[PDB]
Design an enzyme around this catalytic site. Structure first.
Site, PDB file in Angstrom:
ATOM      1  N   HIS A  61      16.390  -4.118  21.438  1.00  0.00           N
ATOM      2  CA  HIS A  61      17.819  -3.866  21.348  1.00  0.00           C
ATOM      3  C   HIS A  61      18.244  -2.732  21.924  1.00  0.00           C
ATOM      4  O   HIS A  61      19.390  -2.133  22.325  1.00  0.00           O
ATOM      5  CB  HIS A  61      18.650  -4.126  19.722  1.00  0.00           C
ATOM      6  CG  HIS A  61      17.891  -5.423  19.369  1.00  0.00           C
ATOM      7  ND1 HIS A  61      17.293  -5.020  18.293  1.00  0.00           N
ATOM      8  CD2 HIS A  61      18.298  -7.068  19.782  1.00  0.00           C
ATOM      9  CE1 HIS A  61      16.928  -7.237  17.296  1.00  0.00           C
ATOM     10  NE2 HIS A  61      17.334  -7.702  18.720  1.00  0.00           N
ATOM     11  N   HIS A  93      23.646   4.229  21.480  1.00  0.00           N
ATOM     12  CA  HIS A  93      24.053   2.613  21.303  1.00  0.00           C
ATOM     13  C   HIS A  93      24.664   3.081  22.658  1.00  0.00           C
ATOM     14  O   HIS A  93      25.413   4.675  22.478  1.00  0.00           O
ATOM     15  CB  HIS A  93      25.370   2.164  20.557  1.00  0.00           C
ATOM     16  CG  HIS A  93      24.286   1.968  19.506  1.00  0.00           C
ATOM     17  ND1 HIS A  93      24.578   0.590  18.958  1.00  0.00           N
ATOM     18  CD2 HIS A  93      24.127   2.709  18.472  1.00  0.00           C
ATOM     19  CE1 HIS A  93      23.845   0.337  17.828  1.00  0.00           C
ATOM     20  NE2 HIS A  93      23.622   2.085  17.148  1.00  0.00           N
ATOM     21  N   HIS A 116      23.157   7.928  16.233  1.00  0.00           N
ATOM     22  CA  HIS A 116      23.744   7.390  14.597  1.00  0.00           C
ATOM     23  C   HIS A 116      21.793   8.297  14.148  1.00  0.00           C
ATOM     24  O   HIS A 116      20.716   7.189  14.529  1.00  0.00           O
ATOM     25  CB  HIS A 116      23.595   5.840  14.360  1.00  0.00           C
ATOM     26  CG  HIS A 116      24.072   5.930  14.949  1.00  0.00           C
ATOM     27  ND1 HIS A 116      24.958   3.898  15.365  1.00  0.00           N
ATOM     28  CD2 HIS A 116      25.665   5.649  15.384  1.00  0.00           C
ATOM     29  CE1 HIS A 116      25.928   3.593  15.558  1.00  0.00           C
ATOM     30  NE2 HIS A 116      26.803   4.679  15.491  1.00  0.00           N
ATOM     31  N   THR A 196      24.560  -3.425  13.062  1.00  0.00           N
ATOM     32  CA  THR A 196      23.338  -4.238  14.318  1.00  0.00           C
ATOM     33  C   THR A 196      23.392  -5.150  13.277  1.00  0.00           C
ATOM     34  O   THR A 196      23.207  -4.767  11.904  1.00  0.00           O
ATOM     35  CB  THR A 196      22.015  -3.370  14.301  1.00  0.00           C
ATOM     36  OG1 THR A 196      22.023  -3.008  13.324  1.00  0.00           O
ATOM     37  CG2 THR A 196      22.912  -2.737  15.920  1.00  0.00           C
TER      38      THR A 196
HETATM   39  O1  LIG Z   1      21.688   0.432  14.960  1.00  0.00           O
HETATM   40  N1  LIG Z   1      21.347   1.031  13.850  1.00  0.00           N
HETATM   41  C1  LIG Z   1      19.819   0.395  14.138  1.00  0.00           C
HETATM   42  C2  LIG Z   1      19.085   0.512  12.271  1.00  0.00           C
HETATM   43  C3  LIG Z   1      19.399   0.683  11.872  1.00  0.00           C
HETATM   44  C4  LIG Z   1      20.696   1.305  11.840  1.00  0.00           C
HETATM   45  C5  LIG Z   1      21.351   1.997  13.000  1.00  0.00           C
HETATM   46  S1  LIG Z   1      22.610   2.501  12.764  1.00  0.00           S
HETATM   47 ZN   LIG Z   2      23.156   2.509  15.849  1.00  0.00          ZN
END
Ligand SMILES: O[n+]1ccccc1S
Ligand SMILES: [Zn+2]
Length: 257
Positions: A61, A93, A116, A196
Site C-alpha cells: 500500500h 502517501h 504521517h 487507510t
Molecule cells: O497510513 N497509515 C497506515 C497505518 C496506520 C496509520 C496510517 S496514517
Molecule cells: Zn498514513
C-alpha cells in the site's frame, strides 16, 4: 482486499469497512478561512530524542518505518492532547506527479505527498486497545512540496531499492525522525480517523501548516516502488492517497494567529 486502483480504491472501501462513510472520516480539506485560532491549545511537544526505529516495510500500500513503542521513548504531548502518545510508525502517501499526493488539502491545494507520524495513547496500554477508543491515536501530518532536498529523508530514499515489492522489509535502525520536521510546529487540529482501512475513528489529527521541501529526485524514488509482489506484473506505487472526506459536524482549530 484493498488498494488505490480503479477496482479496489477508496470508492470501494466502504463495502468491507462501512465506517468509510462515517461521521469523523479523514482526511479533510482544511479551509483556512473557517479554522479558528484556539488560544486554549497548550503548547505541542514533540519528544523524539530516544526514538528507536526497528524496520522499514513495503506493505503493498505504501511503506512503513516501525518503531519500538515498548516504553515512552518517542512521544507526542500537548497541543490538543491529554496525556502521552507513543510513536509506533511513520508512513507516507504520494502522487504520480507533483500536483497530487497529499491526503489532507489546504484550501483545496494538494501537496506532492504527506507524511504521517502515528502515535497511540499510553493510557490504553497497546495500539490494538487504543484503536478501540475515540482518543486512542494522534497522527502528526506533514506536507511535502518539491524544492530543495530534505537531508533527513535521504536515509529513507536510499533504502527503497531494497524493498521495491510488497512484503519486502529491511533493517532500519538508528533513524532519527526529528530530521523530517519543518521549522514551525504551527498546526491545525480536528478529530478524525485512519485514512487507510480499517478507517478507525480514533485519531486526533495534528496537521502542520509549514510543508517540508523534498527534491524532485527524492520523490521520484518513492514513485519507483511497486504495489505488486516480487516477480508479479509491475504496478508502480503512486497515488496511494485517499481524497478528502466530508467534514460533517466538525471543527478545525488553528494553533496560531
Ligand atoms: O497510513 N497509515 C497506515 C497505518 C496506520 C496509520 C496510517 S496514517
Ligand atoms: Zn498514513
Amino acid at each position: 482486499h484493498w488498494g488505490y486502483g480503479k477496482h479496489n480504491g477508496p470508492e470501494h472501501w466502504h463495502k468491507d469497512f462501512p465506517i468509510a462513510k462515517g461521521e469523523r472520516q479523514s482526511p479533510v480539506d482544511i479551509d483556512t478561512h473557517t479554522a479558528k485560532y484556539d488560544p486554549s491549545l497548550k503548547p505541542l511537544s514533540v519528544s523524539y530524542d530516544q526514538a528507536t526505529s526497528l524496520r522499514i516495510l513495503n506493505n503493498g500500500h505504501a511503506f512503513n518505518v516501525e518503531f519500538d513503542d515498548s516504553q515512552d521513548k518517542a512521544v507526542l504531548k500537548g497541543g490538543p492532547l491529554d496525556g502521552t502518545y507513543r510513536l509506533i510508525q511513520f508512513d507516507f502517501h504520494w502522487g504520480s506527479l507533483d500536483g497530487q499526493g497529499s491526503e489532507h488539502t489546504v484550501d483545496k491545494k494538494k501537496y506532492a505527498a504527506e507524511l504521517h507520524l502515528v502515535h497511540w495513547n499510553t493510557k490504553y496500554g497497546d495500539f490494538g486497545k487504543a484503536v478501540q477508543q475515540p482518543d486512542g491515536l494522534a497522527v502528526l501530518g506533514i506536507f511535502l512540496k518539491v524544492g530543495s532536498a530534505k537531508p533527513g529523508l535521504q536515509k529513507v530514499v536510499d533504502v527503497l531499492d531494497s524493498i521495491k515489492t510488497k512484503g519486502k522489509s529491511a533493517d532500519f535502525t538508528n533513524f532519527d525522525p526529528r530530521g523530517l520536521l519543518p521549522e514551525s510546529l504551527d498546526y491545525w487540529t480536528y478529530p478524525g480517523s485512519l485514512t487507510t482501512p480499517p478507517l478507525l475513528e480514533c485519531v486526533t489529527w495534528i496537521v502542520l501548516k509549514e510543508p517540508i521541501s523534498v527534491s524532485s529526485e527524492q520523490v521520484l524514488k518513492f514513485r519507483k516502488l511497486n504495489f505488486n509482489g516480487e516477480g508479479e506484473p509491475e504496478e508502480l506505487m503512486v497515488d496511494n492517497w485517499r481524497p478528502a472526506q466530508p467534514l460533517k459536524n466538525r471543527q478545525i482549530k488553528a494553533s496560531f494567529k
